[PDB]
Amino acid sequence: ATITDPRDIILAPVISEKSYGLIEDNVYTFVVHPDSNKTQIKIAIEKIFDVKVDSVNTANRQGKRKRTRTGFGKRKSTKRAIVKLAAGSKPIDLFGA
Amino acid sequence: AAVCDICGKGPGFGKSVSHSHRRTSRRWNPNIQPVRAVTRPGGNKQRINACTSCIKAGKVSRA
RNA sequence: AUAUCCUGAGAGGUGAUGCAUAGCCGAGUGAGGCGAAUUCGGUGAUCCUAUGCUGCCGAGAAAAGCCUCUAGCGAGGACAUA
RNA sequence: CCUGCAUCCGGUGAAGCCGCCGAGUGAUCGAGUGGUGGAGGGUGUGGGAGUGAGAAUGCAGGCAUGAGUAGCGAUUAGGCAAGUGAGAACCUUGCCCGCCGAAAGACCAAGGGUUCCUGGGCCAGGCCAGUCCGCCCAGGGUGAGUCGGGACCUAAGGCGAGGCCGACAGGCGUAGUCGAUGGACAACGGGUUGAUAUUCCCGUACCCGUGUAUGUGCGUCCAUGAUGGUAGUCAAGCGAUGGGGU
RNA sequence: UGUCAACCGAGCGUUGAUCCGAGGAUGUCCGAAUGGGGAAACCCGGCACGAGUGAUGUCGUGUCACCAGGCGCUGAAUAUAUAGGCGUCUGGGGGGAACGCGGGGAAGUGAAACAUCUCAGUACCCGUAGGAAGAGAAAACAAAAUGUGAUUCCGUGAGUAGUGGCGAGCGAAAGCGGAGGAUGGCUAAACCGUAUGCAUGUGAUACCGGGUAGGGGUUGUGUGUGCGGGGUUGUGGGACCUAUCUUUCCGGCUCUACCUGGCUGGAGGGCAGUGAGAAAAUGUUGUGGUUAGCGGAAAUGGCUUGGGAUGGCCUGCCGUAGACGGUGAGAGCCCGGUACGUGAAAACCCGACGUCUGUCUUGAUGGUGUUCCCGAGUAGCAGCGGGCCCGUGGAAUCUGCUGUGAAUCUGCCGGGACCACCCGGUAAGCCUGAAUACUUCCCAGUGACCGAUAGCGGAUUAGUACCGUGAGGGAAUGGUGAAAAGUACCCC
Ligand SMILES: [Mg+2]
Ligand SMILES: [Mg+2]
Ligand SMILES: [Mg+2]
Ligand SMILES: [Mg+2]
Ligand SMILES: [Mg+2]
Ligand SMILES: [Mg+2]
Ligand SMILES: [Mg+2]
Ligand SMILES: [Mg+2]
Ligand SMILES: [Mg+2]
Ligand SMILES: [Mg+2]
Ligand SMILES: [Mg+2]
Ligand SMILES: [Mg+2]
Ligand SMILES: [Mg+2]
Ligand SMILES: [Mg+2]
Ligand SMILES: [Mg+2]
Ligand SMILES: [Mg+2]
Ligand SMILES: [Mg+2]
Ligand SMILES: [Mg+2]
Ligand SMILES: [Mg+2]
Ligand SMILES: [Mg+2]
Ligand SMILES: [Mg+2]
Ligand SMILES: [Mg+2]
Ligand SMILES: [Mg+2]
Ligand SMILES: [Mg+2]
Ligand SMILES: [Mg+2]
Ligand SMILES: [Mg+2]
Ligand SMILES: [Mg+2]
Ligand SMILES: [Mg+2]
Ligand SMILES: [Mg+2]
Ligand SMILES: [Mg+2]
Ligand SMILES: [Mg+2]
Ligand SMILES: [Mg+2]
Ligand SMILES: [Mg+2]
Ligand SMILES: [Mg+2]
Ligand SMILES: [Mg+2]
Ligand SMILES: [Mg+2]
Ligand SMILES: [Mg+2]
Ligand SMILES: [Mg+2]
Ligand SMILES: [Mg+2]
Ligand SMILES: [Mg+2]
Ligand SMILES: [Mg+2]
Ligand SMILES: [Mg+2]
Ligand SMILES: [Mg+2]
Ligand SMILES: [Mg+2]
Ligand SMILES: [Mg+2]
Ligand SMILES: [Mg+2]
Ligand SMILES: [Mg+2]
Ligand SMILES: [Mg+2]
Ligand SMILES: [Mg+2]
Ligand SMILES: [Mg+2]
Ligand SMILES: [Mg+2]
Ligand SMILES: [Mg+2]
Ligand SMILES: [Mg+2]
Ligand SMILES: [Mg+2]
Ligand SMILES: [Mg+2]
Ligand SMILES: [Mg+2]
Ligand SMILES: [Mg+2]
Ligand SMILES: [Mg+2]
Ligand SMILES: [Mg+2]
Ligand SMILES: [Mg+2]
Ligand SMILES: [Mg+2]
Ligand SMILES: [Mg+2]
Ligand SMILES: [Mg+2]
Ligand SMILES: [Mg+2]
Ligand SMILES: [Mg+2]
Ligand SMILES: [Mg+2]
Ligand SMILES: [Mg+2]
Ligand SMILES: [Mg+2]
Ligand SMILES: [Mg+2]
Ligand SMILES: [Zn+2]
């Protein structure tokens, strides 16, 4: 039978200037499965990183559309989430800046 | 007014001929009427379409 | 009976020792700091009282919700504060 | 042209193309010669043809004149100094002048999808040149318990379990469920980066749910009461798929 | 470490990678779609069991249509009972290039027009299953031959006998010669038994073949239905009595005990079996083939032109292998393989060898006169239409509809009206392989067929771009060379 684990929903981190600023202000931004949920993100993140979380947010964007001499192609569509840590403010080292 | 529910006699199709020997389409339909069938001795009957052939032969009784 | 109830513009206090701004200092792809007075009249709405009031006939949606009634369940439930 | 048969030629240059020189009464011919090329061809005798172009206002592809002629798509109109760079009247900065302003401005829904920002260049495009672009390249960018929708309700209409009718195929319509341009429903001011704001932050609000504690505090088990007054019900607290108001 | 199409960084492999052959799991969502909803791939739940929080919020695995047919319970107005309602099992909803069966079913056009005709029972649609289908065991032909003997499919029989505004056109049968063998089997009626009911009974001298006898129910006597024997046919056959011949043992029955004649069970010996004639399962063979592979003969020959020999001349060898491709220019002896041999873990199907199933031997053989049977709104008749050459004409035969409506063996129907005499046959119930029709797919082969405006629309981004809101329409785009060694470097 299948085994459910809270570590199978969040996909990957995103590196950018805005993400670095939000990290400076103690806010992280993850990439989350298209069919997941805010409650999924909150429960999984708190369980895995044993750090109290205050609030979460989610947002999705459509994929780009690039030209190709063969024809027209489309990239993948992704759903990303925003997590704001509680007053505990336990920095995460696994992010690696 | 299409078919007997008992014997299942469907309408037949043929060609009608005028006195000028010109052809045209026409249909014949068997004589069927609404009657209440006598099948159960209990004394109850139900509305079922029937044909004169079946009625006269008595496949559904008269009472 | 302006009895009693409901509604309710506008006015008044609170929100505000807060925020912002005319300006003054250095400082220029620009940021920082400081920062006065804030009283009285006229005009006046297509906006509010208003699902108001007055006239007219061609005579003008439903469900949900809310209140209530019992039918019926019922020994824990209701209110207030943190 | 393809084929049966028997033969000969060919990296010491076979097939087309462009000349010279010649030849047959014709449709033409040259195992006679020159340049280009690189891979299969000719003669003899039989068999089979998608076997022979100049015209159908024929069709596919390429190219002539009119022609370096008309235009370069309004009712406002530009000018100057400096800068960038090889190139500047058409790009950037500064100063004058004009125009619009019930719009030539600021926004919503419908409508398109990456046209938004950053960084790169200018063989394709912009009716001319372009350092520029709604050109393209690479990366980045879209934050709601309260805004618009769904989880709330319905109309004109569509589907339709049963059923009726119909030779078959099929037409109808009950119960129900679908269908906003409507009804009800709880947040405002200011600041912020190259791109986000009633979403982030600051300050103060409002509406539903769960847990713990506390205080008002009422009954189940005692029993006063009202009674219809020994006994049987009960008014606590919820309360409708039902009735009635709104 | 697939490919378009280079390039980088990363790695595995003798402990057997990659590959191919067979079987096995996962298999998001939509799509008959079936927990409920809906604009395809998007929204919302119930129930049970588990995971997580101080509790809601959350998450995993199952399950939650409709219809029809069995089985069980229940029984409204309303009484008998039905409809209807609940529980549980079994089946169905769609797709597929061609091939079949039964229906419906058109108009252009020829007749130099055109109504009849023909185009045509064509296109299309409907309901239908299979790998093939349908049809099929004479109520068949012919004509004095002492003939054929189920059905189907081809060639003749002939463009003749016929038919038609006797125009345009349309078009058989019998017989004969071929492919195959199964000239096969079942089922209702005449009569006994049995669960029954509807009944009635002289309820007693009748139900049982004779005799001795007990009694009043194997009801005394009728009716319709379910269940087992005996029968299946044309020179008619089948049921009842009467003689003859009769190839195992025992028991209980023909009301009953005793002898005679019949019914039924338990044991030899044959009979077949996946079969149409009855159906279910369980125990031991073919180098049978197939899904991969493996073995497999002979010149580095010499001289020459050459960038390259697989070109020319001269010498050898193999041939159960000189089919066909690749390799720097036409290769039997360079490579891939061809002739030939082998060869499979698993699985497939065929065939053969083995427990088990079931009728019969309580029964078979040849005769006789008497009483009953041989498929019901059918055959025939009358009216209106079809398709057979037959275009209502004298109209035979088959068939659709409406009325009327028959008989059971000296009965009935057929030989193109009809009568008489002859001759053939036995419809009104059901199965049946072999001869035949076709390719969406796979395997192996062939071309006096095309070579980039030809060839399928498609040798490349293909039913794409593009056009049209829709059904739909529908494009053009190969050759460097042996290898890229794709021109370092210098100069404008
Ligand atoms: Mg594109
Ligand atoms: Mg009918
Ligand atoms: Mg017809
Ligand atoms: Mg006609
Ligand atoms: Mg006014
Ligand atoms: Mg040739
Ligand atoms: Mg030669
Ligand atoms: Mg050469
Ligand atoms: Mg040369
Ligand atoms: Mg050449
Ligand atoms: Mg010849
Ligand atoms: Mg010739
Ligand atoms: Mg010829
Ligand atoms: Mg031709
Ligand atoms: Mg020409
Ligand atoms: Mg042209
Ligand atoms: Mg011209
Ligand atoms: Mg001019
Ligand atoms: Mg001009
Ligand atoms: Mg213009
Ligand atoms: Mg300029
Ligand atoms: Mg103006
Ligand atoms: Mg104006
Ligand atoms: Mg105006
Ligand atoms: Mg719009
Ligand atoms: Mg939109
Ligand atoms: Mg831009
Ligand atoms: Mg640029
Ligand atoms: Mg340019
Ligand atoms: Mg251009
Ligand atoms: Mg760009
Ligand atoms: Mg949100
Ligand atoms: Mg309806
Ligand atoms: Mg239905
Ligand atoms: Mg309906
Ligand atoms: Mg709806
Ligand atoms: Mg609406
Ligand atoms: Mg905003
Ligand atoms: Mg496999
Ligand atoms: Mg699975
Ligand atoms: Mg479904
Ligand atoms: Mg559905
Ligand atoms: Mg059933
Ligand atoms: Mg009853
Ligand atoms: Mg089907
Ligand atoms: Mg004519
Ligand atoms: Mg004509
Ligand atoms: Mg015809
Ligand atoms: Mg089949
Ligand atoms: Mg048959
Ligand atoms: Mg038949
Ligand atoms: Mg013939
Ligand atoms: Mg003719
Ligand atoms: Mg019998
Ligand atoms: Mg029988
Ligand atoms: Mg050489
Ligand atoms: Mg050689
Ligand atoms: Mg060869
Ligand atoms: Mg080679
Ligand atoms: Mg060759
Ligand atoms: Mg090999
Ligand atoms: Mg006729
Ligand atoms: Mg006739
Ligand atoms: Mg005769
Ligand atoms: Mg005879
Ligand atoms: Mg018969
Ligand atoms: Mg066949
Ligand atoms: Mg060419
Ligand atoms: Mg279109
Ligand atoms: Zn009938």
Curated annotation (Swiss-Prot), chain A:
SUPFAM superfamilies: Ribosomal proteins S24e, L23 and L15e. It comes from the Bacteria. GO terms for biological process: translation. GO terms for cellular component: ribonucleoprotein complex; ribosome. GO terms for molecular function: rRNA binding; structural constituent of ribosome. Keywords: Ribonucleoprotein, Ribosomal protein, RNA-binding, rRNA-binding. Signal peptide: none annotated. Part of the 50S ribosomal subunit. Contacts protein L29, and trigger factor when it is bound to the ribosome. PANTHER family: 60S RIBOSOMAL PROTEIN L23A. One of the early assembly proteins it binds 23S rRNA. One of the proteins that surrounds the polypeptide exit tunnel on the outside of the ribosome. Forms the main docking site for trigger factor binding to the ribosome. Belongs to the universal ribosomal protein uL23 family. This is Large ribosomal subunit protein uL23.
